[PDB]
Amino acid sequence: GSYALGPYQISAPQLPAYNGQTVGTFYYVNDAGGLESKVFSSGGPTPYPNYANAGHVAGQSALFMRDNGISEGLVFHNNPEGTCGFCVNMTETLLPENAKMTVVPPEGAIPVKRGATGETKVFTGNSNSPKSPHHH
DNA sequence: GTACCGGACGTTGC
DNA sequence: GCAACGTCCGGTAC
Ligand SMILES: [Mg+2]
Ligand SMILES: [Zn+2]
């Protein structure tokens, strides 16, 4: 159960036991060839409150990639119900065009609501961008 | 406490 | 083609 990030072959790191708030670890490769990690916890403040997936682990990872121009990313999260339907449908919007982010739920994740998946998904970014919000 | 609410994208039942 | 449907989000309301 390992995943290819450039020349690195990475498996799931130890994540906190799911307490209701999803937590994930994100990995990318910097300009020097080294591997960098960053820990994300779902549901902080966000530039895109009009995007239901922006505050999730995969959404924060995608905005971190867009913001920093990262072309390829890997992220593991701890949610036994899997990646939700908003993530599945909106990450490619959040992503910059042709960026690749693979999202890995915990082993044996079982989706229970519409749209969710318990399987690894590889999102590739599309030319659309997140609409900037308003004060409704 | 709790049952919607609300922007938003793609999926899909009618 | 139209509209239901999907977060634990943050927010108003029974
Ligand atoms: Mg996009
Ligand atoms: Zn999600």
Author numbering: 1290 to 1425
Give the article text.
Recent studies have identified a dsDNA deaminase from Burkholderia cenocepacia, DddA, an interbacterial toxin that is delivered to contacting cells by the type VI secretion system and mediates antagonism between Gram-negative bacteria. However, unlike APOBECs that only deaminate ssDNA, DddA selectively deaminates cytosines in dsDNA. Interestingly, DddA shares a strong preference for the 5′-TC target sequence with A3A, A3B and several other APOBEC family members. The crystal structures show that DddA engages the minor groove of a sharply bent dsDNA.
To understand how DddA interacts with dsDNA substrates, we crystallized the toxin domain (Gly1290 to Pro1422) of B. cenocepacia DddA in complex with a 14-base pair (bp) dsDNA substrate containing the 5′-TC target sequence. DddA with a substitution of the catalytically essential glutamic acid residue (E1347A) was used to capture the enzyme–substrate complex. The structure of the DddA–dsDNA complex was determined in two different crystal forms and refined to 2.39 and 2.62 Å resolution, respectively. The structures obtained in the two crystal forms are very similar overall, with a root mean square deviation (r.m.s.d.) of 1.37 Å for all protein and DNA atoms, and of 0.45 Å for the protein backbone atoms, although they differ in the conformation of the target 2′-deoxycytidine nucleotide. In the structure with the cytosine base parked in the DNA major groove, Glu1370 side chain is pointed away from the DNA. DddA Phe1375 intercalates in dsDNA and displaces the 5′ (−1) thymine, which in turn replaces the target cytosine and forms a noncanonical T–G base pair with the juxtaposed guanine. This tandem displacement mechanism allows DddA to locate a target cytosine without flipping it into the active site. The DddA–dsDNA structure trapped with the target cytosine parked in the major groove suggests that DddA can locate 5′-TC motifs in double-stranded DNA without engaging the cytosine base in the active site. It may represent an intermediate conformation that allows DddA to scan through a DNA sequence to locate target cytosines.
